[PDB]
Design a protein around this ligand. Structure first.
Ligand code: GDP
Ligand code: GDP
Ligand code: MG
Ligand code: MG
Lengths: 174, 171
């Protein structure tokens, strides 16, 4: 039987960067320009199997008060829109907000979203890689529209959170 | 006021992976087959750093909690020898000894050392990248012998520790 893990994660980033679209792509495996997100739902749920380690993860994916939004989160995706430089500048403010609300660091994966929009891209790959490296975060280029690397971003975060759970088990078992 | 930081870091990994050689290349700019202090500047952010670089003498066995060695550490380099698979298998055990001893996670940079030994290499780049990614660690391929990426490994660790210091100040 697989090992079982459960985590709440948060989607972070400025408005219109694709937080809802990425969550819909991951949980419902489609994209719709006219998707209507409803106010009557704090989070989506995904159950994910990781073959490499025979582990099953149940995720609650929260997407925008602030205190309740962050409370209990064990990880997050930190998104920007590669076509809008202001959304990239603001990822640091989102990281700081999350860490201040939780009073601890949690793992974040930096997600450069909308990479399918090649002709209007303004934030270069190397800029995002550098920001992530400076914070020891992983970096993923994604498109909710095409699906490119969307599952990969969430799976990467899941593996990090599992390794942290294991670390904590060892610390409590000395 | 100009930003000054001081960190204790640990060099981790099995015997003969190159912990001393990497530190000697970094602090003294040489390699010879026969704690340490470093001052460095991260000029991109105009940050001055003082490092105290600790490493274990000999080849000690793993301990549930290792007294003294880890106390006060804020980061480390986790080294293996790309020509010896056992040293790669053991990096997880060193990571856990540090975390058990500190009762917290600290940032580690995974360092695949001795990459100059191309014909004898047995641990592939992708294997190290995967291990690092699973823990949200950065990954560097280095050689104390040539000097390749030695400065970069320590500099990246310093920047991570600085960002964590700033996180703590914000929190
Ligand atoms: N081309 C493209 N459009 C996207 C992508 N992700 C989101 N969008 C569009 O960008 C707009 C904002 O997305 P939304 O999910 O509402 O962003 P949120 O405000 O961060 O939740 C919508 O028109 C989406 O259809 C993407 O990867 N590629
Ligand atoms: N070819 C090569 N040899 C190395 C390198 N780093 C260390 N060595 C050699 O490997 C042996 C062990 O290195 P040492 O610094 O004593 O490892 P430690 O036990 O981890 O401190 C010594 O003979 C070093 O000269 C490297 O990058 N390339
Ligand atoms: Mg939305
Ligand atoms: Mg030594």
């Amino acid at each position: 039987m697989p090992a079982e893990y459960r985590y709440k994660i948060v989607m972070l980033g400025d408005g219109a960067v694709g937080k809802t679209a990425m969550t819909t792509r991951f949980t419902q495996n489609f994209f719709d320009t006219d998707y209507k997100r409803t106010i009557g739902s704090d989070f989506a749920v995904k159950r994910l199997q990781l073959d490499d380690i025979n582990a099953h993860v149940t995720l609650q994916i929260w997407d925008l008060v602030r205190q309740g939004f962050y409370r209990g989160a064990r990880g997050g995706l930190l998104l920007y829109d590669v076509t809008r430089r202001r959304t990239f500048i603001n990822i640091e403010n989102w990281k700081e907000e999350a860490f201040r609300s939780l009073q601890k660091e949690i793992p974040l994966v930096v997600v450069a979203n909308k990479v399918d929009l090649k002709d209007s891209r303004v934030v270069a790959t190397e800029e995002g890689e550098e920001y992530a490296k400076n914070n020891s975060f992983m970096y993923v280029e994604s498109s909710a529209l095409t699906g490119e690397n969307v599952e990969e971003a969430y799976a990467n975060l899941c593996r990090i959170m599992i390794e942290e759970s294991k670390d904590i088990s060892e610390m409590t078992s000395t």
